[PDB]
């Protein structure tokens, strides 16, 4: 589903989360931007990489990765004190992306 | 009141009278019989249930601000609750593409 | 789930976090401070209140299937309840043009039928 | 508000309740018709009256009254075991009109 990104999943170059009028786009210029009828958000990462992709890690941080480099272009938040686990980014009805976790209850797989 | 979303339930949100979350061929339904059921197909096909059928005529399910999922009757008595609770905050219940319903929280960070 | 209506709340529906009923210059607001307030003139003159401010940060109001109105906290404890309790069925809370919020029920008949 | 009819109020000739795509109309032909997308309803009182009007009584019944009354043209439901009191008809999101009552709680009069 296009409104959700779970830990270990990736948003590829020029792909996006969307809900209604809002989109969170991993751009070809390597900038990650939230477009909404409101206050947007940017990684401000224009031109910092090639064929960039976005992943949500096991600490609730977004990582932008570049084809041309081993270490991430950007990680946000840069530092966290979270439990290692499964996290979810949701682009809500609020037109924002909120990261939630770790997982605390679930039905049995699967 | 938070607007209803097809595949996700947010803290403070409520479901009742056969309302559901859905993705693909999966449904998470708060049935009119007080039973919360995750079904696929349904080859009339239940994956998980609260097992609370017959405990109420006007039950609702609610996700709380401690990640708790409660099924509650008209009298406000709880007929099922998930074991967990976390830090006070905002949580989400997601019906996943893998057929699991999962609660995640609290909010680590947001673009807002 | 029943769709939200501006002037009426149906049994099983809930209001939270500043959600309201409205008609004319009247509103009934379930405030983010756990107080249920009925006011006249975009916000100001308070006609009625539950007086439950500060009782919770995640409170909700719910109209029940005996006509009762409960203000409930995150822990599911009831902060305030109205004194009503009619026969089991479906009820309606209407914010009327005369400035009163009134609960009516149960349902007698329907075109539905 | 056009989605509510209270006891003792009236819908006049060629006026209606409305909510979204639903209308409950007291027609000039004296027929009371629910127009919707979900299965209609009508009094079937075409031509039974003139300058007809619709009232909700203190038992939760609708009454159609005619200019030459004296007795109502139509009463619905036909017989009722309800208490005397104040009732409300709501044309809901279901596109139907449901009658609720009697009143069980109220905030204070203004004022």
UniProtKB/Swiss-Prot annotation, chain B:
Residue span relative to the full protein: 112 to 223 of 224
Domain Bulb-type lectin: 6-111
Disulfide bonds: 34-59
Protein name listed in UniProt: Mannose-specific lectin 3 chain 2
Swiss-Prot record, chain D:
Domain Bulb-type lectin, chain residue ranges per copy: 2-110
Disulfide bonds, paired cysteine numbers: 30-52
Superkingdom: Eukaryota
Protein name stated in the entry: Mannose-specific lectin 3 chain 1
Residues included from the entire protein: 1 to 110 of 224
């Amino acid at each position: 589903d296009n409104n959700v990104l779970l830990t270990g999943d990736v948003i590829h170059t020029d792909n996006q989360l969307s809900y209604e009028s809002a989109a969170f786009v991993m751009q070809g210029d390597c900038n990650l931007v939230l477009y909404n009828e409101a206050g947007g958000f940017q990684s401000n990462t224009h031109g910092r990489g090639v064929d960039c992709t976005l992943r949500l890690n096991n600490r609730g941080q977004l990582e932008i990765h570049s084809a041309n480099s081993n270490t991430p272009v950007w990680v946000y938040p840069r530092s966290v004190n979270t439990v290692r686990g499964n996290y979810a980014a949701t682009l809500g009805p609020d037109q924002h992306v909120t990261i939630y976790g770790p997982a605390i209850w679930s039905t049995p797989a699967a | 009141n938070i607007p209803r979303v097809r595949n996700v339930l947010f803290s403070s949100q409520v479901m009742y009278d056969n309302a559901q979350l859905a993705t693909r061929d999966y449904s998470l339904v708060m049935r009119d019989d007080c039973n919360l059921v995750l079904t696929k197909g349904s080859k009339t096909n239940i994956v998980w249930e609260s097992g609370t059928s017959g405990r109420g005529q006007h039950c609702f399910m609610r996700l709380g601000h401690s990640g708790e999922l409660d099924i509650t009757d008209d009298r406000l008595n709880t007929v099922f609750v998930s074991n967990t609770v976390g830090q006070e905050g905002d949580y989400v219940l997601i019906l996943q593409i893998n057929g699991q319903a999962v609660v995640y929280g609290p909010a680590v960070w947001s673009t807002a």
